[PDB]
Amino acid sequence: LGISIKVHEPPRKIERFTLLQSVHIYKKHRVQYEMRTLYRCLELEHLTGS
Amino acid sequence: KNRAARVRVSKGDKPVTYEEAHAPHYIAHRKGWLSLHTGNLDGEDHAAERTVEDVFLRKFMWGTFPGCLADQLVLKRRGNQLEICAVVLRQLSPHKYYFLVGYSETLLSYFYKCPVRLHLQTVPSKVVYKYL
Amino acid sequence: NHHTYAELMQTLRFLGLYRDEHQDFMDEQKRLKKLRGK
Amino acid sequence: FNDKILNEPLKHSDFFNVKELFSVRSLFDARVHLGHKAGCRHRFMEPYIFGSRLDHDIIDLEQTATHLQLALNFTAHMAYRKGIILFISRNRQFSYLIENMARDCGEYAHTRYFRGGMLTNARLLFGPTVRLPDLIIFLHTLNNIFEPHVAVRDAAKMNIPTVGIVDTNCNPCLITYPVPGNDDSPLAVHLYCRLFQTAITRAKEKRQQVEALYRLQ
Amino acid sequence: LNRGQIIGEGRYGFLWPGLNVPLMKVQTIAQRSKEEQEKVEADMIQQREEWDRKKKMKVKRERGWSGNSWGGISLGPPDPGPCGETY
RNA sequence: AUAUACCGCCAUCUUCAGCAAACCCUGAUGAAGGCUACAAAGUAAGCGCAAGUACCCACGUAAAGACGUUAGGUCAAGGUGUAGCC
Numbered sequence A: 001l002g003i004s005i006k007v008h009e010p011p012r013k014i015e016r017f018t019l020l021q022s023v024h025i026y027k028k029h030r031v032q033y034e035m036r037t038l039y040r041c042l043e044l045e046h047l048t049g050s
Numbered sequence B: 001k002n003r004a005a006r007v008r009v010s011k012g013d014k015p016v017t018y019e020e021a022h023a024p025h026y027i028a029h030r031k032g033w034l035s036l037h038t039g040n041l042d043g044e045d046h047a048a049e050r051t052v053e054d055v056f057l058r059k060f061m062w063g064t065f066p067g068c069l070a071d072q073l074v075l076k077r078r079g080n081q082l083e084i085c086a087v088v089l090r091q092l093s094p095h096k097y098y099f100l101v102g103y104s105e106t107l108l109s110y111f112y113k114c115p116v117r118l119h120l121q122t123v124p125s126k127v128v129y130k131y132l
Numbered sequence C: 001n002h003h004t005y006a007e008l009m010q011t012l013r014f015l016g017l018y019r020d021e022h023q024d025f026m027d028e029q030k031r032l033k034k035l036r037g038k
Numbered sequence D: 001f002n003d004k005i006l007n008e009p010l011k012h013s014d015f016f017n018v019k020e021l022f023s024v025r026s027l028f029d030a031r032v033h034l035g036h037k038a039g040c041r042h043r044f045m046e047p048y049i050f051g052s053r054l055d056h057d058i059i060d061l062e063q064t065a066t067h068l069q070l071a072l073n074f075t076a077h078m079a080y081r082k083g084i085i086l087f088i089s090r091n092r093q094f095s096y097l098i099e100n101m102a103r104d105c106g107e108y109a110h111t112r113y114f115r116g117g118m119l120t121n122a123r124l125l126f127g128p129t130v131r132l133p134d135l136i137i138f139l140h141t142l143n144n145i146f147e148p149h150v151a152v153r154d155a156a157k158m159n160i161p162t163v164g165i166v167d168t169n170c171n172p173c174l175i176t177y178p179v180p181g182n183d184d185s186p187l188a189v190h191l192y193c194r195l196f197q198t199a200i201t202r203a204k205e206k207r208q209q210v211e212a213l214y215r216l217q
Numbered sequence E: 001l002n003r004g005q006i007i008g009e010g011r012y013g014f015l016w017p018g019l020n021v022p023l024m025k026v027q028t029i030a031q032r033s034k035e036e037q038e039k040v041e042a043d044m045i046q047q048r049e050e051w052d053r054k055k056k057m058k059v060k061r062e063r064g065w066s067g068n069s070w071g072g073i074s075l076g077p078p079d080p081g082p083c084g085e086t087y
Numbered sequence F: 001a002u003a004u005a006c007c008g009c010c011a012u013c014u015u016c017a018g019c020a021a022a023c024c025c026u027g028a029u030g031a032a033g034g035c036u037a038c039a040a041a042g043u044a045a046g047c048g049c050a051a052g053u054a055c056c057c058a059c060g061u062a063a064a065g066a067c068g069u070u071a072g073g074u075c076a077a078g079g080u081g082u083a084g085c086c
C-alpha cells in the first residue's frame, strides 16, 4: 500500500519470580520461573483513517 | 532427586511420547507450551481467569474422548476464538468421532461464550519418541 | 463458581457423555466396601 | 542338483596334487625344523620333536611333511567348497604379510587384537545373518603373551576345523590339523604363506574348470 | 479397570442418535423406562461378576516334585534363533 | 489414625560418575568375576555425567545430576489404600 514504515525493537522486560520447591520445609531450595515477553514496534507514518 | 515432570527409566519395554519424556527445564528450550494465550505478557490482565478454564478443557476432553486421546491437547486462542487442536488415536468408528466434535464444539461454545473449533488428527498408534 | 463447573460434570456422567476416572474409581471401590464394611 | 563335482574330489586321493609344493628339502632350507628351547617345550610337542641339540629342540621334518599332505589338502577342499577361510596370526612381525596374502588370494585375514566374543558372540557383534568361517588357519598359534590364542577355544566352541602352525612351545590339542614347524623365522613363514596361498588358488581354479565342464555337458 | 463401560451409556437412560444406537436407523433422543435401565443395571452388574470370577480362577498348574517348589517343573521348548532354527 | 501402604513435590551423598537391559567368556557350568592399545574376553543399546541451551562469550554462574541409601520430610497442598466417627 506504499506506506512509509520503520521497525524497531524495544528492550524486553523479563519479570522473573521465585517459588518454593518442596511442598513442605526447605527454604534453602527454591525454583525460579520467568516470563520472557518481547516487543516490536511497527512505526507507521502518515496514513488516512480509511 | 527432583521429580517434577519426568518419567523414570525402568526397563527397556516402556514407551513414551516426546513431551513427557522431556524434563521441565526444557520448556522453551526443547518443547513448546501446550496452550497459547495473551495472559502472561505484562502488563495484561485476564491471565488469571483463563487458566482455570484452560485446565478444565484438558480435563473435560480427557473424559469425553475416553481411551483414545493420544497426548495432551493444544489450546490456541485467537482473539475471541478458542482453537483446540488434538491428535487422537485411530481406534473409534468415525461416526462416533463426528458426534463429539459438534457435541463438544457447541457445548464449549456455550460455556466460554466464544466460538470453539476442533481440529482432530488421527494417528494409528501412540507416537513414541523414546523406548526408555 | 465450582457448582457450575462440578454439577455440569455430574450430569454429563449421568447422561454418560463424559466418562471420568475419579468417580469411576469411587463407585467401583465403594461397591467393594459395601460388600463387607458397611 | 550340483553334487557331481562335490563327490569326485573326496574319492580322489590328493586330488589337487599338493605333494609338489613341498618336500623335506624345501622345509629344511627355510628353517622350519628349528624349535625353541627345551626349557619351554610343551607336553604335546613331545611326539613331533626329533631331539634336542645342545638344548635346541629340533622338529621332525618327516612327521611335519606327513601332516602337510593332509593339512594343505583339507584347506584346498575348503577353498573348493567355497567356505570362508580366516587367516589369523598375532606375530606383529608378519602382520603386514598375512593381510597382504589375504588380498593376493580371495580369502580372509584377521591379524589384529582379538575382540572378546568374535566367534562365540558373532550374532550381536554383527548382523544376525553371518556365515562364520569354515576353517581358521593359524600362523602363530601363540598369542603376544605366550599362552595359546583365544580362537583355539572359540574355534572349537563354534565347531570349526582349524589348521594351525604349532611350534615347540605351542598347544596342538584343540586344533585339528597341527603343522609341527617353525613360525618365528622370517624365511619360515614366507614359505608357509607361499604354500597356503598357492594351495587354495590352485584349489579355486580347480573349482572353476569343473563347473564349466558341467555347464557344457 | 475401565473395561465394562461403553462411551454413551449413563444411568439416566438416554439413547443418543450417534452413540449407543445403531447408526441413524434412530435420530431421536429416547428416554427409556425405569424398568429397562433397571434391567440394564442388572445386565451391567451381572456382567461384572463374570469377569470377577474369571479373575478368581484356580488353574490346574502342573507340579514338579512338590507344589510351591520350582523343582522338576517344565517350561516350553527353547525359543528359536533369530534367523530360523525351530526347536 | 497411619508419610511404616502411597501418588504428588523434594531433601541428601551429589562441590559423584556411575546404573545398566540383551548377549558372550572364565570359573571342573559355586556365590561371583571380566582389567593390560607392543592389549590376556568382553560386547553393547538405554539412563546419567559430558554435549547443548539460558545470562554478557568458549569463561563463569545458573539449570542439570541416573541407580540407590537414610522405611528421610509431608495424609495439614491436593488426591488416595486400609482402619475409624455419622
Ligand SMILES: [Mg+2]
Pocket (backbone or CB within 6 Å): A029, B002
Ligand atoms: Mg536440587
Ligand SMILES: [Mg+2]
Pocket (backbone or CB within 6 Å): E067, E068
Ligand atoms: Mg502345597
Ligand SMILES: [Mg+2]
Pocket (backbone or CB within 6 Å): none
Ligand atoms: Mg543448582
Ligand SMILES: [Mg+2]
Pocket (backbone or CB within 6 Å): F064
Ligand atoms: Mg551438563
Ligand SMILES: [Mg+2]
Pocket (backbone or CB within 6 Å): none
Ligand atoms: Mg519418620
Ligand SMILES: [Zn+2]
Pocket (backbone or CB within 6 Å): D036, D167, D168, D169, D183, D184
Ligand atoms: Zn615360536
